[PDB]
Amino acid sequence: LAQSRIVDQMAGRGLIDDSSDLHVGINRHRIRIWAGLAVLQMMGLLSRSEAEALTKVLGDSNALGMVVA
Amino acid sequence: GFNLKVKDLNGSARGLTQAFAIGELKNQLSVGALQLPLQFTRTFSASMTSELLWEVGKGNIDPVMYARLFFQYAQAGGALSVDELVNQFTEYHQSTACNPEIWRKLTAYITGSSNRAIKADAVGKVPPTAILEQLRTLAPSEHELFHHITTDFVCHVLSPLGFILPDAAYVYRVGRTATYPNFYALVDCVRASDLRRMLTALSSVDSKMLQATFKAKGALAPALISQHLANAATTAFERSRGNFDANAVVSSVLTILGRLWSPSTPKELDPSARLRNTNGIDQLRSNLALFIAYQDMVKQRGRAEVIFSDEELSSTIIPWFIEAMSEVSPFKLRPINETTSYIGQTSAIDHMGQPSHVVVYEDWQFAKEITAFTPVKLANNSNQRFLDVEPGISDRMSATLAPIGNTFAVSAFVKNRTAVYEAVSQRGTVNSNGAEMTLGFPSVVERDYALDRDPMVAIAALRTGIVDESLEARASNDLKRSMFNYYAAVMHYAVAHNPEVVVSEHQGVAAEQGSLYLVWNVRTELRIPVGYNAIEGGSIRTPEPLEAIAYNKPIQPSEVLQAKVLDLANHTTSIHIWPWHEASTEFAYEDAYSVTIRNKRYTAEVKEFELLGLGQRRERVRILKPTVAHAIIQMWYSWFVEDDRTLAAARRTSRDDAEKLAIDGRRMQNAVTLLRKIEMIGTTGIGASAVHLAQSRIVDQMAGRGLIDDSSDLHVGINRHRIRIWAGLAVLQMMGLLSRSEAEALTKVLGDSNALGMVVA
Amino acid sequence: TNGIDQLRSNLALFIAYQDMVKQRGRAEVIFSDEELSSTIIPWFIEAMSEVSPFKLRPINETTSYIGQT
Numbered sequence: 001l002a003q004s005r006i007v008d009q010m011a012g013r014g015l016i017d018d019s020s021d022l023h024v025g026i027n028r029h030r031i032r033i034w035a036g037l038a039v040l041q042m043m044g045l046l047s048r049s050e051a052e053a054l055t056k057v058l059g060d061s062n063a064l065g066m067v068v069a
Numbered sequence: 070g071f072n073l074k075v076k077d078l079n080g081s082a083r084g085l086t087q088a089f090a091i092g093e094l095k096n097q098l099s100v101g102a103l104q105l106p107l108q109f110t111r112t113f114s115a116s117m118t119s120e121l122l123w124e125v126g127k128g129n130i131d132p133v134m135y136a137r138l139f140f141q142y143a144q145a146g147g148a149l150s151v152d153e154l155v156n157q158f159t160e161y162h163q164s165t166a167c168n169p170e171i172w173r174k175l176t177a178y179i180t181g182s183s184n185r186a187i188k189a190d191a192v193g194k195v196p197p198t199a200i201l202e203q204l205r206t207l208a209p210s211e212h213e214l215f216h217h218i219t220t221d222f223v224c225h226v227l228s229p230l231g232f233i234l235p236d237a238a239y240v241y242r243v244g245r246t247a248t249y250p251n252f253y254a255l256v257d258c259v260r261a262s263d264l265r266r267m268l269t270a271l272s273s274v275d276s277k278m279l280q281a282t283f284k285a286k287g288a289l290a291p292a293l294i295s296q297h298l299a300n301a302a303t304t305a306f307e308r309s310r311g312n313f314d315a316n317a318v319v320s321s322v323l324t325i326l327g328r329l330w331s332p333s334t335p336k337e338l339d340p341s342a343r344l345r346n347t348n349g350i351d352q353l354r355s356n357l358a359l360f361i362a363y364q365d366m367v368k369q370r371g372r373a374e375v376i377f378s379d380e381e382l383s384s385t386i387i388p389w390f391i392e393a394m395s396e397v398s399p400f401k402l403r404p405i406n407e408t409t410s411y412i413g414q415t416s417a418i419d420h421m422g423q424p425s426h427v428v429v430y431e432d433w434q435f436a437k438e439i440t441a442f443t444p445v446k447l448a449n450n451s452n453q454r455f456l457d458v459e460p461g462i463s464d465r466m467s468a469t470l471a472p473i474g475n476t477f478a479v480s481a482f483v484k485n486r487t488a489v490y491e492a493v494s495q496r497g498t499v500n501s502n503g504a505e506m507t508l509g510f511p512s513v514v515e516r517d518y519a520l521d522r523d524p525m526v527a528i529a530a531l532r533t534g535i536v537d538e539s540l541e542a543r544a545s546n547d548l549k550r551s552m553f554n555y556y557a558a559v560m561h562y563a564v565a566h567n568p569e570v571v572v573s574e575h576q577g578v579a580a581e582q583g584s585l586y587l588v589w590n591v592r593t594e595l596r597i598p599v600g601y602n603a604i605e606g607g608s609i610r611t612p613e614p615l616e617a618i619a620y621n622k623p624i625q626p627s628e629v630l631q632a633k634v635l636d637l638a639n640h641t642t643s644i645h646i647w648p649w650h651e652a653s654t655e656f657a658y659e660d661a662y663s664v665t666i667r668n669k670r671y672t673a674e675v676k677e678f679e680l681l682g683l684g685q686r687r688e689r690v691r692i693l694k695p696t697v698a699h700a701i702i703q704m705w706y707s708w709f710v711e712d713d714r715t716l717a718a719a720r721r722t723s724r725d726d727a728e729k730l731a732i733d734g735r736r737m738q739n740a741v742t743l744l745r746k747i748e749m750i751g752t753t754g755i756g757a758s759a760v761h762l763a764q765s766r767i768v769d770q771m772a773g774r775g776l777i778d779d780s781s782d783l784h785v786g787i788n789r790h791r792i793r794i795w796a797g798l799a800v801l802q803m804m805g806l807l808s809r810s811e812a813e814a815l816t817k818v819l820g821d822s823n824a825l826g827m828v829v830a
Numbered sequence: 831t832n833g834i835d836q837l838r839s840n841l842a843l844f845i846a847y848q849d850m851v852k853q854r855g856r857a858e859v860i861f862s863d864e865e866l867s868s869t870i871i872p873w874f875i876e877a878m879s880e881v882s883p884f885k886l887r888p889i890n891e892t893t894s895y896i897g898q899t
Contacts, residue, residue, distance in 0.1 A: 001500050003500055004497075004500025004501055005500075018724060019495070019724055465860075682854050754858075757856060758855055761855035765852075
């Protein structure tokens with residue numbers, strides 16, 4: 001759904017409507033966290049000031065898949 | 070036909086979501102999990118097609134057929150339901166059979182004069198009929214029917230005596246009935262079930278005794294014929310009653326069934342000894358097909374107290390006294406899938422693979438033959454009108470329809486939208502479903518279009534689910550009269566695939582009067598971008614019937630059903646039919662059309678009848694109102710709407726050139742396709758007559774305005790596409806289906822598309 | 831068929847074909863058959879059933895009321 005929305009954003013400006021350009025490899029894992037973010041806050045569990053931490057720590061490393069997927 | 074999202078169908082066709090069959094809305098979409106399993110099996114059969122004449126005819130009187138007729142006209146008539154009709158019949162039966170002075174007058178109209186019954190002599194100066202007029206002089210019925218039947222009764226007891234002289238014949242048509250639906254209809258069926266014996270007791274017993282008293286040879290009889298007749302007839306009325314309440318008996322047996330079905334506590338209601346499996350109610354344990362009756366039962370009403378419960382009873386008698394075993398009605402009865410054996414199915418779709426286009430439908434008729442008639446009436450009274458077909462037109466118009474059956478091969482026609490599926494790439498898939506894809510039911514259209522209600526308004530009524538309360542007994546409920554069948558649709562072919570069942574009562578927080586539908590585990594592929602109920606685990610469980618199909622294979626329908634016109638003329642050459650009026654007047658149309666040759670109009674028109682080459686104008690020929698096909702062509706029309714809307718949007722943005730030309734390429738031949746078939750609609754019998762006369766009118770108009778100079782216009786393409794498509798469309802106008810707006814919209818379609826050809830031709 | 835050929839001799843009813851295409855157009859025999867007709871239908875033609883002022887005669891007697899100067 002969020003991908004549907006930003007793909008709709010691709011339709012915003014008419015030239016970046018040139019089909020999907022996100023999907024290669026890194027983006028998928030990069031947004032894979034977002035699922036863990038909905039699972040984070042207002043899944044009814046985590047209290048924020050949290051993904052904050054996770055963000056910095058996800059910045060700490062190469063992450064990648066690291067393999068898988 | 071229409072469409073809806075799969076994940077959001079409750080937000081979409083919210084009424085159609087079966088959870089709606091119960092008062093459920095809630096934060097929750099019904100469901101959960103619980104217990105007791107048994108595939109509910111053996112559904113009542115196929116009332117569709119099977120149209121035919123029946124003969125009231127003889128006074129030997131078969132109550133059974135007449136009952137069938139009562140339900141028949143009742144649905145077909147000006148007064149729902151059967152129930153009130155049976156009341157009215159009982160009223161009439163009092164006013165007649167229980168009103169003796171009449172009978173004195175009747176015998177008086179027969180042999181009556183003096184010192185009746187004029188000793189041993191015969192003399193039966195009567196047509197059956199003349200009696201019927203005399204009774205017509207008596208209390209009118211809004212719905213005579215039985216008014217014939219009472220006469221039939223007069224015949225039956227006067228048959229032993231020399232008054233068989235009148236014997237003519239009486240005839241009446243069927244009427245198609247649906248799935249078939251609502252338990253109120255069952256109420257009609259059970260009171261009619263009473264009619265089987267409410268009536269037969271007077272239809273039977275009767276008298277072999279008295280010939281005519283004998284008293285050799287037999288007999289004198291003053292009022293004694295009327296005496297013996299009516300007083301016994303009234304006596305016959307006494308044994309008749311049926312006692313047991315209509316709605317109550319069904320309410321109770323349904324109660325025991327549904328609570329038998331209950332996974333949550335049966336409590337004091339329970340399976341038991343002779344409470345149940347009384348060598349028949351257990352057969353109902355096998356007839357659990359009439360499920361849904363419990364659904365609306367709590368919905369139409371609420372708590373289902375057995376009130377006349379007892380515990381010996383019932384058991385005992387009442388379930389025995391259930392309707393289907395008394396077999397009136399199009400109540401019908403059968404095993405499983407044969408009712409589903411008219412379900413189309415096409416998964417289509419791709420890569421995902423499951424969702425964007427998965428259609429269903431039905432196999433269907435085109436016995437081209439269709440008929441029309443004069444309404445000859447040997448004597449004024451009502452509508453007992455004799456009619457004879459008008460073969461000279463009737464054949465050729467049917468002949469005109471002959472190619473048309475090869476046209477619009479609806480199965481092949483389905484392939485159309487299926488073909489649309491690859492449009493438009495590329496794969497979604499999670500962000501926006503899924504799609505309805507599926508419905509486009511010929512059946513739902515015909516069921517309502519038969520009353521010319523126009524189903525299409527009912528369609529949106531199932532979009533929002535709620536009825537828009539068009540308060541009128543032949544308005545609002547009739548909409549709902551369809552909606553039931555509509556639900557009744559999917560469930561049945563939701564049986565096959567899969568006999569998975571149960572579900573629970575879903576009390577929610579309010580209120581436990583009972584609320585239990587069905588569930589379907591089926592079996593699945595391991596991916597679920599379809600259905601809010603993610604429950605992919607092995608398979609969906611599943612709360613709503615459609616998802617099964619959504620996870621179903623294309624299977625491709627067996628499906629063969631296709632009706633047939635009744636022979637009619639071969640019998641009404643002798644005897645009157647009574648769906649008439651209904652069949653209507655009925656002769657449109659003056660389809661004028663312009664040809665805008667440069668800066669000039671030259672519009673032409675033609676007077677229907679001479680297209681048939683007949684002369685002159687006919688006043689009173691009476692075409693039927695053929696059904697079926699309307700649904701097909703409408704579906705074709707609306708689906709084209711889905712088509713060009715989708716494709717045009719696709720070129721509007723998707724996005725990315727390789728696809729746009731594809732679709733805009735696609736677009737072209739779609740229209741090109743229709744172009745071609747439209748000539749088959751016309752210039753091949755009988756619209757060639759249409760183009761002929763059009764050419765006549767136009768060139769003669771050239772001469773009349775003066776010059777025929779510029780009039781090369783019997784020639785090519787543009788004008789030819791004009792006149793030809795106009796022609797096939799025109800005979801199609803003479804065809805009683807698809808109005809007129811469809812015409813202008815259609816030429817609106819071709820006009821941008823391209824037109825080019827030059828296909829002619 | 832010992833009669834339709836008499837119609838081959840009755841070709842006076844010419845013009846009927848004229849308006850036939852004119853009043854209508856194509857003249858498909860539709861109940862054509864090939865045994866029929868032949869067989870019965872031409873036999874069942876009207877003038878032989880002789881109703882009407884349909885009348886019947888040789889040539890010029892109908893013209894025998896034509897003035898000429």
